Amino acid sequence: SKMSDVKCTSVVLLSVLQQLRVESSSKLWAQCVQLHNDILLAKDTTEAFEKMVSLLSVLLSMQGAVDINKL
Amino acid sequence: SEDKRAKVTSAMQTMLFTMLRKLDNDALNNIINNARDGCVPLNIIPLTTAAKLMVVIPDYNTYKNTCDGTTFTYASALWEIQQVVDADSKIVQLSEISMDNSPNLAWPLIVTALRAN
Protein backbone atom coordinates (compact mmCIF):
# COMPACT_ATOMS: atom_id res chain seq x y z
CA SER A 1 0.00 0.00 0.00
CA LYS A 2 2.83 2.38 0.89
CA MET A 3 4.63 1.00 -2.16
CA SER A 4 1.90 2.08 -4.58
CA ASP A 5 1.93 5.54 -3.01
CA VAL A 6 5.66 6.15 -3.47
CA LYS A 7 5.53 4.84 -7.05
CA CYS A 8 2.55 7.09 -7.76
CA THR A 9 4.46 10.00 -6.23
CA SER A 10 7.52 9.37 -8.40
CA VAL A 11 5.39 9.74 -11.53
CA VAL A 12 4.10 13.06 -10.20
CA LEU A 13 7.64 14.15 -9.31
CA LEU A 14 8.91 13.45 -12.83
CA SER A 15 5.92 15.32 -14.25
CA VAL A 16 6.63 18.35 -12.06
CA LEU A 17 10.22 18.28 -13.29
CA GLN A 18 8.98 17.89 -16.87
CA GLN A 19 6.83 21.03 -16.59
CA LEU A 20 9.92 22.79 -15.24
CA ARG A 21 11.64 22.07 -18.58
CA VAL A 22 14.26 19.68 -17.19
CA GLU A 23 14.05 17.96 -20.59
CA SER A 24 16.08 20.94 -21.83
CA SER A 25 18.98 19.43 -19.89
CA SER A 26 19.69 16.15 -21.66
CA LYS A 27 21.93 14.46 -19.10
CA LEU A 28 19.90 15.56 -16.07
CA TRP A 29 16.61 14.44 -17.62
CA ALA A 30 18.10 11.03 -18.41
CA GLN A 31 19.07 10.74 -14.74
CA CYS A 32 15.55 11.63 -13.63
CA VAL A 33 13.90 9.14 -16.00
CA GLN A 34 16.28 6.41 -14.83
CA LEU A 35 15.49 7.13 -11.17
CA HIS A 36 11.78 7.23 -11.98
CA ASN A 37 12.06 3.91 -13.82
CA ASP A 38 13.92 2.17 -10.99
CA ILE A 39 11.36 3.39 -8.45
CA LEU A 40 8.52 1.88 -10.47
CA LEU A 41 10.48 -1.38 -10.70
CA ALA A 42 11.53 -1.19 -7.04
CA LYS A 43 10.65 -4.32 -5.09
CA ASP A 44 11.50 -2.93 -1.64
CA THR A 45 10.91 0.40 0.10
CA THR A 46 14.60 0.77 0.94
CA GLU A 47 15.53 0.97 -2.74
CA ALA A 48 12.46 3.01 -3.69
CA PHE A 49 12.85 5.70 -1.03
CA GLU A 50 16.59 6.08 -1.64
CA LYS A 51 16.00 6.76 -5.34
CA MET A 52 13.18 9.14 -4.40
CA VAL A 53 15.60 11.16 -2.28
CA SER A 54 17.85 11.69 -5.30
CA LEU A 55 14.94 12.41 -7.65
CA LEU A 56 13.41 14.93 -5.23
CA SER A 57 16.82 16.54 -4.72
CA VAL A 58 16.79 17.58 -8.38
CA LEU A 59 13.61 19.55 -7.74
CA LEU A 60 14.87 21.08 -4.49
CA SER A 61 18.16 22.03 -6.18
CA MET A 62 16.35 24.34 -8.59
CA GLN A 63 16.21 27.93 -7.32
CA GLY A 64 12.72 29.41 -7.24
CA ALA A 65 11.24 26.26 -8.78
CA VAL A 66 9.10 25.52 -5.73
CA ASP A 67 7.15 28.06 -3.70
CA ILE A 68 8.72 27.79 -0.24
CA ASN A 69 5.27 28.03 1.36
CA LYS A 70 4.37 24.60 -0.05
CA LEU A 71 7.19 22.98 1.93
CA SER B 1 -4.10 29.01 -20.81
CA GLU B 2 -0.77 30.59 -19.92
CA ASP B 3 -1.98 31.49 -16.44
CA LYS B 4 -3.81 28.16 -16.31
CA ARG B 5 -0.57 26.23 -16.80
CA ALA B 6 0.73 28.03 -13.74
CA LYS B 7 -2.28 27.07 -11.62
CA VAL B 8 -1.89 23.46 -12.76
CA THR B 9 1.82 23.52 -11.91
CA SER B 10 0.99 25.00 -8.51
CA ALA B 11 -1.78 22.47 -7.88
CA MET B 12 0.44 19.57 -8.96
CA GLN B 13 3.26 20.73 -6.67
CA THR B 14 0.92 21.10 -3.69
CA MET B 15 -0.33 17.55 -4.25
CA LEU B 16 3.27 16.37 -4.69
CA PHE B 17 4.46 17.48 -1.25
CA THR B 18 1.18 16.42 0.34
CA MET B 19 1.83 12.93 -1.03
CA LEU B 20 5.45 13.12 0.12
CA ARG B 21 4.41 14.15 3.63
CA LYS B 22 1.93 11.26 3.69
CA LEU B 23 4.76 8.83 2.95
CA ASP B 24 6.39 9.98 6.20
CA ASN B 25 9.91 8.99 5.18
CA ASP B 26 12.70 10.35 7.38
CA ALA B 27 15.11 10.94 4.50
CA LEU B 28 12.55 12.74 2.34
CA ASN B 29 11.26 14.69 5.34
CA ASN B 30 14.78 15.84 6.19
CA ILE B 31 15.74 17.30 2.80
CA ILE B 32 12.30 18.91 2.56
CA ASN B 33 12.71 20.62 5.96
CA ASN B 34 16.22 21.76 5.25
CA ALA B 35 14.97 23.13 1.94
CA ARG B 36 12.33 25.10 3.85
CA ASP B 37 15.11 26.73 5.88
CA GLY B 38 17.17 27.49 2.79
CA CYS B 39 19.43 24.46 3.13
CA VAL B 40 19.28 22.92 -0.32
CA PRO B 41 21.29 20.57 -2.54
CA LEU B 42 23.46 22.26 -5.15
CA ASN B 43 23.47 19.07 -7.22
CA ILE B 44 21.47 15.84 -7.33
CA ILE B 45 22.03 13.76 -4.18
CA PRO B 46 24.57 11.03 -5.07
CA LEU B 47 23.37 7.43 -5.45
CA THR B 48 26.80 5.96 -4.72
CA THR B 49 29.94 7.10 -2.89
CA ALA B 50 31.50 7.67 -6.32
CA ALA B 51 29.60 10.94 -6.75
CA LYS B 52 29.92 13.75 -4.21
CA LEU B 53 27.19 15.64 -2.34
CA MET B 54 27.04 19.44 -2.46
CA VAL B 55 24.71 21.31 -0.11
CA VAL B 56 24.15 25.03 0.46
CA ILE B 57 24.48 26.19 4.07
CA PRO B 58 22.73 29.59 4.42
CA ASP B 59 23.84 30.46 7.96
CA TYR B 60 25.88 29.33 10.98
CA ASN B 61 22.73 28.10 12.72
CA THR B 62 22.12 25.63 9.90
CA TYR B 63 25.79 24.63 9.98
CA LYS B 64 25.70 24.07 13.74
CA ASN B 65 22.57 21.94 13.32
CA THR B 66 23.77 19.81 10.41
CA CYS B 67 27.52 19.67 11.10
CA ASP B 68 29.43 18.09 13.97
CA GLY B 69 33.18 17.78 13.55
CA THR B 70 33.83 16.33 10.10
CA THR B 71 30.36 14.74 10.00
CA PHE B 72 27.48 16.23 7.99
CA THR B 73 23.95 15.04 8.75
CA TYR B 74 21.63 15.20 5.75
CA ALA B 75 18.76 13.16 4.25
CA SER B 76 18.63 11.16 7.50
CA ALA B 77 22.15 9.93 6.72
CA LEU B 78 25.74 10.71 7.69
CA TRP B 79 28.24 12.29 5.29
CA GLU B 80 32.00 12.76 5.61
CA ILE B 81 32.83 16.37 4.75
CA GLN B 82 35.45 16.62 2.01
CA GLN B 83 35.61 20.40 1.61
CA VAL B 84 33.87 23.68 2.47
CA VAL B 85 33.85 26.86 0.37
CA ASP B 86 32.30 30.30 0.84
CA ALA B 87 30.16 32.52 -1.39
CA ASP B 88 33.39 33.74 -3.00
CA SER B 89 34.24 30.11 -3.82
CA LYS B 90 37.25 30.33 -1.51
CA ILE B 91 38.21 27.33 0.63
CA VAL B 92 37.06 27.46 4.25
CA GLN B 93 38.51 25.29 7.02
CA LEU B 94 36.03 23.71 9.44
CA SER B 95 37.91 25.28 12.35
CA GLU B 96 37.12 28.70 10.87
CA ILE B 97 33.39 28.12 11.19
CA SER B 98 32.35 29.20 14.67
CA MET B 99 29.99 31.46 16.60
CA ASP B 100 32.62 34.21 16.82
CA ASN B 101 34.18 33.94 13.36
CA SER B 102 30.98 33.49 11.33
CA PRO B 103 30.37 37.22 10.70
CA ASN B 104 33.74 37.36 8.92
CA LEU B 105 32.82 34.40 6.71
CA ALA B 106 31.10 34.89 3.36
CA TRP B 107 27.70 33.18 3.45
CA PRO B 108 26.26 30.97 2.12
CA LEU B 109 28.77 28.14 2.48
CA ILE B 110 28.82 25.07 0.24
CA VAL B 111 29.57 21.71 1.88
CA THR B 112 31.04 18.88 -0.19
CA ALA B 113 30.74 15.39 1.28
CA LEU B 114 30.68 11.64 0.66
CA ARG B 115 28.11 9.23 2.13
CA ALA B 116 29.32 7.77 5.43
CA ASN B 117 26.43 5.32 5.86
List the helices and strands and how they pair.
The complex is a heterodimer of chains A (about 70) and B (about 120).
Chain A: H1 2-19, H2 26-40, H3 45-60
Chain B: H1 2-23, H2 26-36, E1 40-41, E2 53-57, H3 60-66, E3 67-68, E4 71-74, E5 77-85, E6 109-115
Antiparallel strand pairs in B: 1-2, 2-6, 3-4, 4-5, 5-6
PDB class: viral protein
Keywords: nsp7, nsp8, SARS-CoV-2, nCoV-2019, covid-19, viral protein
Assembly: dimeric
What does it look like?
The complex is a heterodimer of chains A (71) and B (117). By secondary structure, chain A is an all-alpha fold. Chain A has one domain (1-71). Chain A is 69% helix and 0% strand. Chain A contains three helices and no strands. In chain A, helix 2 (26-40) packs antiparallel against helix 3. Chain B has one domain (25-115): Alpha-Beta Plaits (2-Layer Sandwich), CATH 3.30.70. Helix content of chain B is 34%, strand content 25%. Chain B has helices at residues 2-23, 26-36, 60-66, and strands at residues 40-41, 53-57, 67-68, 71-74, 77-85, 109-115. A six-stranded antiparallel β-sheet of chain B has the order 1-2-6-5-4-3. In chain B, strand 3 (67-68) and strand 4 form a beta hairpin. The A-B interface holds A 2, 5-6, 8-9, 12-13, 15-16, 19, 28, 31, 49-54, 56-58, 60-61, 66-68, 70-71 and B 5, 8-10, 12-17, 19-20, 22-23, 25, 27-28, 31-33, 35-36, 40-47, 75. The PDB classes it as viral protein. Keywords: nsp7, nsp8, SARS-CoV-2, nCoV-2019, covid-19, viral protein.
